[PDB]
Design a protein around this nucleic acid. Structure first.
Ligand SMILES: CON(C)Cc1ccc(O)c2c1C[C@H]1C[C@H]3[C@H](N(C)C)C(O)=C(C(N)=O)C(=O)[C@@]3(O)C(O)=C1C2=O
Ligand SMILES: [Mg+2]
Ligand SMILES: [Mg+2]
Ligand SMILES: [Mg+2]
Ligand SMILES: [Mg+2]
Ligand SMILES: [Mg+2]
Ligand SMILES: [Mg+2]
Ligand SMILES: [Mg+2]
Ligand SMILES: [Mg+2]
Ligand SMILES: [Mg+2]
Ligand SMILES: [Mg+2]
Ligand SMILES: [Mg+2]
Ligand SMILES: [Mg+2]
Ligand SMILES: [Mg+2]
Ligand SMILES: [Mg+2]
Ligand SMILES: [Mg+2]
Ligand SMILES: [Mg+2]
Ligand SMILES: [Mg+2]
Ligand SMILES: [Mg+2]
Ligand SMILES: [Mg+2]
Ligand SMILES: [Mg+2]
Ligand SMILES: [Mg+2]
Ligand SMILES: [Mg+2]
Ligand SMILES: [Mg+2]
Ligand SMILES: [Mg+2]
Ligand SMILES: [Mg+2]
Ligand SMILES: [Mg+2]
Ligand SMILES: [Mg+2]
Ligand SMILES: [Mg+2]
Ligand SMILES: [Mg+2]
Ligand SMILES: [Mg+2]
Ligand SMILES: [Mg+2]
Ligand SMILES: [Mg+2]
Ligand SMILES: [Mg+2]
Ligand SMILES: [Mg+2]
Ligand SMILES: [Mg+2]
Ligand SMILES: [Mg+2]
Ligand SMILES: [Mg+2]
Ligand SMILES: [Mg+2]
Ligand SMILES: [Mg+2]
Ligand SMILES: [Mg+2]
Ligand SMILES: [Mg+2]
Ligand SMILES: [Mg+2]
Ligand SMILES: [Mg+2]
Ligand SMILES: [Mg+2]
Ligand SMILES: [Mg+2]
Ligand SMILES: [Mg+2]
Ligand SMILES: [Mg+2]
Ligand SMILES: [Mg+2]
Ligand SMILES: [Mg+2]
Ligand SMILES: [Mg+2]
Ligand SMILES: [Mg+2]
Ligand SMILES: [Mg+2]
Ligand SMILES: [Mg+2]
Ligand SMILES: [Mg+2]
Ligand SMILES: [Mg+2]
Ligand SMILES: [Mg+2]
Ligand SMILES: [Mg+2]
Ligand SMILES: [Mg+2]
Ligand SMILES: [Mg+2]
Ligand SMILES: [Mg+2]
Ligand SMILES: [Mg+2]
Ligand SMILES: [Mg+2]
Ligand SMILES: [Mg+2]
Ligand SMILES: [Mg+2]
Ligand SMILES: [Mg+2]
Ligand SMILES: [Mg+2]
Ligand SMILES: [Mg+2]
Ligand SMILES: [Mg+2]
Ligand SMILES: [Mg+2]
Ligand SMILES: [Mg+2]
Ligand SMILES: [Mg+2]
Ligand SMILES: [Mg+2]
Ligand SMILES: [Mg+2]
Ligand SMILES: [Mg+2]
Ligand SMILES: [Mg+2]
Ligand SMILES: [Mg+2]
Ligand SMILES: [Mg+2]
Ligand SMILES: [Mg+2]
Ligand SMILES: [Mg+2]
Ligand SMILES: [Mg+2]
Ligand SMILES: [Mg+2]
Ligand SMILES: [Mg+2]
Ligand SMILES: [Mg+2]
Ligand SMILES: [Mg+2]
Ligand SMILES: [Mg+2]
Ligand SMILES: [Mg+2]
Ligand SMILES: [Mg+2]
Ligand SMILES: [Mg+2]
Ligand SMILES: [Mg+2]
Ligand SMILES: [Mg+2]
Ligand SMILES: [Mg+2]
Ligand SMILES: [Mg+2]
Ligand SMILES: [Mg+2]
Ligand SMILES: [Mg+2]
Ligand SMILES: [Mg+2]
Ligand SMILES: [Mg+2]
Ligand SMILES: [Mg+2]
Ligand SMILES: [Mg+2]
Ligand SMILES: [Mg+2]
Ligand SMILES: [Mg+2]
Ligand SMILES: [Mg+2]
Ligand SMILES: [Mg+2]
Ligand SMILES: [Mg+2]
Ligand SMILES: [Mg+2]
Ligand SMILES: [Mg+2]
Ligand SMILES: [Mg+2]
Ligand SMILES: [Mg+2]
Ligand SMILES: [Mg+2]
Ligand SMILES: [Mg+2]
Ligand SMILES: [Mg+2]
Ligand SMILES: [Mg+2]
Ligand SMILES: [Mg+2]
Ligand SMILES: [Mg+2]
Ligand SMILES: [Mg+2]
Ligand SMILES: [Mg+2]
Ligand SMILES: [Mg+2]
Ligand SMILES: [Mg+2]
Ligand SMILES: [Mg+2]
Ligand SMILES: [Mg+2]
Ligand SMILES: [Mg+2]
Ligand SMILES: [Mg+2]
Ligand SMILES: [Mg+2]
Ligand SMILES: [Mg+2]
Ligand SMILES: [Mg+2]
Ligand SMILES: [Mg+2]
Ligand SMILES: [Mg+2]
Ligand SMILES: [Mg+2]
Ligand SMILES: [Mg+2]
Ligand SMILES: [Mg+2]
Ligand SMILES: [Mg+2]
Ligand SMILES: [Mg+2]
Ligand SMILES: [Mg+2]
Ligand SMILES: [Mg+2]
Ligand SMILES: [Mg+2]
Ligand SMILES: [Mg+2]
Ligand SMILES: [Mg+2]
Ligand SMILES: [Mg+2]
Ligand SMILES: [Mg+2]
Ligand SMILES: [Mg+2]
Ligand SMILES: [Mg+2]
Ligand SMILES: [Mg+2]
Ligand SMILES: [Mg+2]
Ligand SMILES: [Mg+2]
Ligand SMILES: [Mg+2]
Ligand SMILES: [Mg+2]
Ligand SMILES: [Mg+2]
Ligand SMILES: [Mg+2]
Ligand SMILES: [Mg+2]
Ligand SMILES: [Mg+2]
Ligand SMILES: [Mg+2]
Ligand SMILES: [Mg+2]
Ligand SMILES: [Mg+2]
Ligand SMILES: [Mg+2]
Ligand SMILES: [Mg+2]
Ligand SMILES: [Mg+2]
Ligand SMILES: [Mg+2]
Ligand SMILES: [Mg+2]
Ligand SMILES: [Mg+2]
Ligand SMILES: [Mg+2]
Ligand SMILES: [Mg+2]
Ligand SMILES: [Mg+2]
Ligand SMILES: [Mg+2]
Ligand SMILES: [Mg+2]
Ligand SMILES: [Mg+2]
Lengths: 96, 67
RNA sequence: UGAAUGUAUAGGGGUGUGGGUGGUAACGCGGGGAAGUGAAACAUCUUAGUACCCGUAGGAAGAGAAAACAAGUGUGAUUCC
RNA sequence: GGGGCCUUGUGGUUCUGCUGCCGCAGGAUUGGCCAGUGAGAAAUGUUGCGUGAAGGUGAAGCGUCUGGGAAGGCGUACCGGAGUGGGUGAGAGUCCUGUAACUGUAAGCGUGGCACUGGUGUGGGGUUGCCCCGAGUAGCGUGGGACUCGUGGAAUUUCGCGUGAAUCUGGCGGGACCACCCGUCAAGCCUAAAUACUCCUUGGUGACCGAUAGUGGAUGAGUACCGUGAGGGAAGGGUGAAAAGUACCCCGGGAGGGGAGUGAAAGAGUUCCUGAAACCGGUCGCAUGCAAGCCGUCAGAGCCUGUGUGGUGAUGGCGUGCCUUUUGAAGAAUGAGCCUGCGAGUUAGUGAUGCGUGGCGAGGUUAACCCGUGGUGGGGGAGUCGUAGCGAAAGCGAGUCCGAUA
RNA sequence: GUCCGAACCCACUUCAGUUGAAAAUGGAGGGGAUGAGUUGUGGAUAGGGGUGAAAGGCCAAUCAAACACCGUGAUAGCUGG
RNA sequence: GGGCUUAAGUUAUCCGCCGAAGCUGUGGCAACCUGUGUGGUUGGGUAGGGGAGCGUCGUGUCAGUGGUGAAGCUGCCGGGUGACUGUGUGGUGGAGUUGAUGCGAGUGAGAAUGCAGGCAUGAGUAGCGUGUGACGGGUGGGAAUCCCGUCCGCCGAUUAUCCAAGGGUUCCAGGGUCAAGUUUGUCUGCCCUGGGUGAGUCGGGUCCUAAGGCGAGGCCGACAGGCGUAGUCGAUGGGUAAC
RNA sequence: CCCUAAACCGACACUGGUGGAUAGGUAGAGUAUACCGAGGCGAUCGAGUGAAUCGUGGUGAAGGAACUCGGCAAAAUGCCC
RNA sequence: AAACGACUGUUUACCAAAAACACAGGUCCGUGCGAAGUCGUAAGACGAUGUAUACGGACUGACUCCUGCCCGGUGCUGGAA
RNA sequence: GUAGCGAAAUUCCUUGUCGGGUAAGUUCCGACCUGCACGAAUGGAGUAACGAUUUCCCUACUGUCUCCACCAUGAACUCGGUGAAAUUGCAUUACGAGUAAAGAUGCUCGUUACGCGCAGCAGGACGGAAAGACCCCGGGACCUUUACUAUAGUUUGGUAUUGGUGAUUGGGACGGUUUUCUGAUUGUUCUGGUUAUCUCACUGUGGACCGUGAUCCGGUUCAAGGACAGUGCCUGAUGGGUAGUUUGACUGGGGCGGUCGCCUCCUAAAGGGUAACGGAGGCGCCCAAAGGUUCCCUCAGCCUGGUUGGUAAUCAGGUGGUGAGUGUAAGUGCACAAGGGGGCUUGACUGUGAGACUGACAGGUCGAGCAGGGACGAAAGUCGGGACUAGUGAUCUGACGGUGGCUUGUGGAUGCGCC
């Protein structure tokens, strides 16, 4: 920077740490679930969301931005509270 | 060969979902007694870089997504 | 054969049993090990265990058959990509 | 785990000593599951394969035209498991060498593999009572080194100096350390393959160079030459299809030339293909000895030529080089004597980041490697980017974080 | 380690040379000339080292760290292209 | 500047003209904007940004072409807005190469006190390295510079003679005059061919040791190596038989 | 065969450097110097011409350092008894 | 006649030959011998086949007359509450 | 600062002053002392002899000169032969006064000049030769030292090599004298300091002997040392002997001096901004009140009267609007007071920040409204330090307190993260 203390020295270091064993949840939304299983997907699974798109060999958390007018049984790894509430409101369920 | 990323840039700069470059505010590590609570509030946040500084940081990060 | 000397050894006298000496472009292994350079100076650091050097191979060498990994199941020598 | 302690099992035996006239071991042509020239506790002859080094066979065109010469033109046939090349007086599938295909290899120290010969040879179950399981080692301290780790919370590993253990109810590892759990059994050794390399050998290849390039080196090249020495280190390729390299004559001491011969060409004559520029001259046209010229440019008479456009240019106007570097250069700032040749934005990353363009598209894409000895094609989705963000993180999630479920 | 003075060794002054006859000389003089003299042959000391009656002198015709090769296409915010 | 007051000086005022790549007229080119029949605006330019091209070499493909003459070189006559060019026409030359469309670059030079070669400028100029030569005759294509002779001059503690070191055939005879020789050259220390060096006693070795070198074992040193004993080399010396 | 060099060391057929031996006559102390001997050379571009000028020597009236930074150079002195 | 150096010598090969170096003489410090000192990692070696009248280092520089005051600072030597 | 010496190889002033020498003497040489800034082994003062040393004088002598002339020669010059060199953007390359990068053959205005040679001379072409050797800026090298950081070497102690036995001195174990204890202890064991002994550790040494008929080396032995020394490792000191390097910039060249961040004013041209080694000053604090709030008050000066008492202390009356005052510079403010005084207090808060100001950025500044929990006030309301603007330092690294997010098999620990 010409001898002036450069930005990458004047800015303080963002401290913190990384979790050595952090796992990342592949996330699928209710919009996507409705769009890719419109005929009232009875039992969606990890393999089904993978053949659609979830980037398999990972945990397959489902989130809840959307409407989900159909009844669906997700059977996935973890889910959000709003997603679960919408699913039982529509008449479906989650497992695992 | 692969281009290494700048270590200080990795440790100091973040990239948001919309491509904004943000750093931590400077001047709050010590000598905080004379500083009012208003000054500490101004210095405790997260600052968004200017366009030129953000471009320089993005060049320094060899595609590293920031901390 | 056995000194000083006692044991005996060193040494001495035979015999010729086998091996060695030196060369070699690159690659190997073990060891010694810079500086210019970069850091816009510079000493930590870098360059780099590089250049060079010593010893020493083989057709390849080194490594190699878990006093290993793994993390809750498991994998099952080493080398190389 | 092994030894020990036993319940059994050794290849069918001639029939030897010992332990107890039980059993154990030596024994001997003979089975033999096997196993072998390997690292494997070892290493000694005869017979079965294609071949490398050399070779052998190896297809099929004449006629006309122009030419010094036919491979070219024209006509017309042939071969092809052969139309890859390279030669031949010019551009050849059938002229030559070969090529395709097949074949031979006697020989090798031959080599590889097979048979034989020959040489070498089993365990399972129970059992703690005992016995053994690699010591100046492992650890520890200290001074250094290697590990992402630059002494640190410093594991693991290593060298020097000290100190120095347990040994199965044991040792070591799982990043200080302890416990438990899981793994493992150091301080003895040997091990093919995948990997690295090319002084060499053989064959082949090139949107590689073509004599200032490519090796320093196309030639007496590591030579000439330079240096006491280590060492440094050049330059010089081309007649023609064939020397047919110019007989003989003339001027000349020769050199060289003039005739003549050879040749398609000799102004291809050896200093030899092509023969550029600087540079040096002969001849012809015009101008030029009253003139002050960055040398040009515009105007322009005359002369020459007319191949009716070109050459030259009296005389008038205007006009201070090129480059570099500079606020500013014709500058008395820098560089350039001249020509010819050479001499500086390249290349590599499944690098970073844009754009153009093409493909596919909520998907896109493979890397290594495998197959194609037939390539540029196919496989390979391990990975990787996109698919949700926010937070130091646990985590939560169209939200998240600071905050008091503000 | 006397005196004068050839050879010999030296190098004080001057002139010439200074694209020289010569990358240090020539002409004219000048100092030493039995001494710490001079010279031949062979040998010894080697680069952060040598040797030096000491000038940083000399070490193969440029020495405040020789030469050659190598690291190496060192680096140069500078100059040129 | 000439010259000017008889203004061609100063000043007020009036009427004309000259005068630029400015403006206008006319012809061509180009960029951009605009509704897209029109038209409008614009086009000096260094550093620098963007866009579109020329030429060279290699190469895929197609079309070809070439001894009835390719490349290169060199005239003339033409062409394009530029790099450049003609499918015009000769000359030289003797084996390749053109157009279209892609692909790949060792792709363009006037400068670097750039590198290599060739060649100018200074210039027929400076110099030709201490000096004494003259003449008669000869040789020869050619003579101041070769040979012979006669005069003359020079050196003479060296311009003589012989060794060592070093050089290496230069020595001798014959043939030669491209090069070399600071000129000429018939001449040469040059070139070519052939020839020439004879030792029991001379100088070295076969004998000896000095300085110093190397060094069986050995001692020392991580390695590499250092030193050194016994020894063994090493003249510049000792020893050694001819004039 | 050259060898106080045209043959060696200096890039040269280079007014430089190069160790040792022999070394006569006359004048002289002398191996200085002059002219000669033994012997060897005439030197490796010449021919001319009274230019300035530069180099190298020579002479000088009267004066005698007035020159000049300075008696620089030259002159004088010089040998033997 | 003055300055400098006592003297003969030595020195910047290639701009300085001197008043600079050396010198004989002087003083101080070290060294009892496997010396101190020096070269070397070491062994060894020089010193020296020497032994304090010797050796090494430092300064001074023939000779004559002399060489004053200061131990606070620094160094050296000795001492150790 | 003595002897001695002194305008000196030292004396700046300076050609000091006087004396000698010359017709004339900044030099000379003899004196003076006013020694800018002599001085006693970095020796002081002298000194016969010596010197291609430096300086002055006399004599002789001369072309050194007045003042040059002449002679001969090697070049020069002409003819024949042979035949370079540095240099070179160019060329048909005048002068004058101008002009221009401020010194022109080349530009302007004029003047002069037929074309070409030969021998000469050096005023110019900022002539040629050497990318200035001075200066500055960047880099390097070597040198120095009480620069920094290291190191060879030298030195200290520990420990290993390294053992035997003693005394002489301190700390416990340990019981059982004292008196668990202010004070004494002894014996039984253990452990330091110091010191002397002993000797097939070791010393590379003095003698002898052997390997051998060897000044190396080794072995045996004697003598002398002796657990010391030596060496390894660890450790403190020393260490320009050696090595790598650092040693700022600004600047009317550099050095010296001064300056470097922040605040106020002027320059600054009536917004903001605006440079100089321009002109003036301040800051690196202070205050638990000099902060918050509420209520109250008005100053300085002047005039008159008054014990001590004066120009001016305290008091009275009159006058007096800002001229006093403001913790601290200056400006802008403040008398409605932001100036003076009393009461009660801790908002010198926690979570925040709509919206703006100002910088290239880092950053700097203001801030309404809200919640929590407070202070003051009857309330309205005000309070996130101070009338305002200086009183300050990014990041890294480390530290303390809190928190408990993470922790490499698990649980701890440890480490880290957050505040
Ligand atoms: C008295 O002031 N005058 C005017 C100067 C001067 C006078 C007379 C001289 O005789 C010399 C000099 C200058 C020096 C310069 C020296 C320099 N060097 C020492 C770094 C240098 O750079 C070179 C060079 N080769 O470039 C030399 O020539 C050099 O060494 C040398 O010799 C010099 C001389 O001769
Ligand atoms: Mg800074
Ligand atoms: Mg903190
Ligand atoms: Mg705070
Ligand atoms: Mg071998
Ligand atoms: Mg370094
Ligand atoms: Mg650096
Ligand atoms: Mg740098
Ligand atoms: Mg192996
Ligand atoms: Mg296995
Ligand atoms: Mg055939
Ligand atoms: Mg035909
Ligand atoms: Mg074991
Ligand atoms: Mg361990
Ligand atoms: Mg350690
Ligand atoms: Mg490390
Ligand atoms: Mg450890
Ligand atoms: Mg763990
Ligand atoms: Mg192995
Ligand atoms: Mg070549
Ligand atoms: Mg060619
Ligand atoms: Mg060539
Ligand atoms: Mg040679
Ligand atoms: Mg023909
Ligand atoms: Mg021709
Ligand atoms: Mg030719
Ligand atoms: Mg030709
Ligand atoms: Mg005329
Ligand atoms: Mg004119
Ligand atoms: Mg300038
Ligand atoms: Mg110029
Ligand atoms: Mg000029
Ligand atoms: Mg310049
Ligand atoms: Mg030039
Ligand atoms: Mg050029
Ligand atoms: Mg996957
Ligand atoms: Mg004498
Ligand atoms: Mg001599
Ligand atoms: Mg001299
Ligand atoms: Mg001269
Ligand atoms: Mg004398
Ligand atoms: Mg020698
Ligand atoms: Mg000096
Ligand atoms: Mg030299
Ligand atoms: Mg150096
Ligand atoms: Mg390197
Ligand atoms: Mg460079
Ligand atoms: Mg320049
Ligand atoms: Mg016009
Ligand atoms: Mg116009
Ligand atoms: Mg117009
Ligand atoms: Mg334009
Ligand atoms: Mg225009
Ligand atoms: Mg441009
Ligand atoms: Mg044809
Ligand atoms: Mg071509
Ligand atoms: Mg093409
Ligand atoms: Mg090029
Ligand atoms: Mg060119
Ligand atoms: Mg050239
Ligand atoms: Mg010429
Ligand atoms: Mg002439
Ligand atoms: Mg001339
Ligand atoms: Mg001439
Ligand atoms: Mg001449
Ligand atoms: Mg002559
Ligand atoms: Mg002659
Ligand atoms: Mg004759
Ligand atoms: Mg004579
Ligand atoms: Mg005589
Ligand atoms: Mg011979
Ligand atoms: Mg011959
Ligand atoms: Mg010869
Ligand atoms: Mg001869
Ligand atoms: Mg000739
Ligand atoms: Mg002849
Ligand atoms: Mg002859
Ligand atoms: Mg013998
Ligand atoms: Mg000897
Ligand atoms: Mg040996
Ligand atoms: Mg002998
Ligand atoms: Mg001998
Ligand atoms: Mg002779
Ligand atoms: Mg000679
Ligand atoms: Mg020679
Ligand atoms: Mg006589
Ligand atoms: Mg004589
Ligand atoms: Mg004679
Ligand atoms: Mg002779
Ligand atoms: Mg000659
Ligand atoms: Mg004449
Ligand atoms: Mg005379
Ligand atoms: Mg006369
Ligand atoms: Mg006279
Ligand atoms: Mg007279
Ligand atoms: Mg007189
Ligand atoms: Mg005078
Ligand atoms: Mg005068
Ligand atoms: Mg004189
Ligand atoms: Mg005389
Ligand atoms: Mg005196
Ligand atoms: Mg004096
Ligand atoms: Mg003297
Ligand atoms: Mg003396
Ligand atoms: Mg002398
Ligand atoms: Mg000498
Ligand atoms: Mg000299
Ligand atoms: Mg002495
Ligand atoms: Mg010693
Ligand atoms: Mg000795
Ligand atoms: Mg002295
Ligand atoms: Mg004292
Ligand atoms: Mg003292
Ligand atoms: Mg002391
Ligand atoms: Mg005076
Ligand atoms: Mg004075
Ligand atoms: Mg006087
Ligand atoms: Mg004294
Ligand atoms: Mg003193
Ligand atoms: Mg003094
Ligand atoms: Mg003295
Ligand atoms: Mg004295
Ligand atoms: Mg005297
Ligand atoms: Mg002298
Ligand atoms: Mg006189
Ligand atoms: Mg002449
Ligand atoms: Mg001539
Ligand atoms: Mg002017
Ligand atoms: Mg003028
Ligand atoms: Mg003019
Ligand atoms: Mg002109
Ligand atoms: Mg002339
Ligand atoms: Mg002339
Ligand atoms: Mg001139
Ligand atoms: Mg000049
Ligand atoms: Mg310069
Ligand atoms: Mg220089
Ligand atoms: Mg110079
Ligand atoms: Mg430096
Ligand atoms: Mg140097
Ligand atoms: Mg010690
Ligand atoms: Mg000890
Ligand atoms: Mg004792
Ligand atoms: Mg004893
Ligand atoms: Mg004793
Ligand atoms: Mg130093
Ligand atoms: Mg230093
Ligand atoms: Mg460095
Ligand atoms: Mg600086
Ligand atoms: Mg500066
Ligand atoms: Mg200044
Ligand atoms: Mg303003
Ligand atoms: Mg304004
Ligand atoms: Mg400004
Ligand atoms: Mg108040
Ligand atoms: Mg506070
Ligand atoms: Mg806001
Ligand atoms: Mg502020
Ligand atoms: Mg509130
Ligand atoms: Mg209340
Ligand atoms: Mg206040
Ligand atoms: Mg207040
Ligand atoms: Mg830092
Ligand atoms: Mg793990
Ligand atoms: Mg907080």
């Amino acid at each position: 920077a010409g001898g002036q203390m450069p930005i990458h020295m004047q800015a303080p270091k963002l401290g913190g740490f990384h979790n050595p064993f952090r796992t990342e949840y592949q996330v699928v939304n209710l919009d996507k679930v409705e769009a890719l299983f419109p005929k009232g997907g009875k039992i969606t699974v990890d393999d089904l969301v993978s053949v659609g798109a979830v980037r398999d060999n990972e945990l397959v958390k489902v989130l809840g931005t959307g409407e989900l007018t159909v009844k669906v049984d997700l059977v996935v790894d973890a889910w959000s509270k709003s997603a679960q509430e919408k699913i039982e409101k529509a008449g479906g369920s989650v497992t695992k | 060969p692969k281009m290494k990323s700048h270590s200080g840039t990795k440790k100091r700069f973040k990239v948001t979902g919309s491509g904004k470059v943000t750093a931590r505010k400077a001047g709050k590590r010590h000598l905080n007694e004379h500083k009012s609570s208003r000054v500490t509030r101004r210095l405790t946040g997260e600052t968004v870089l200017s366009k030129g500084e953000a471009a320089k940081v993005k060049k320094l990060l060899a595609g590293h997504p920031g901390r």
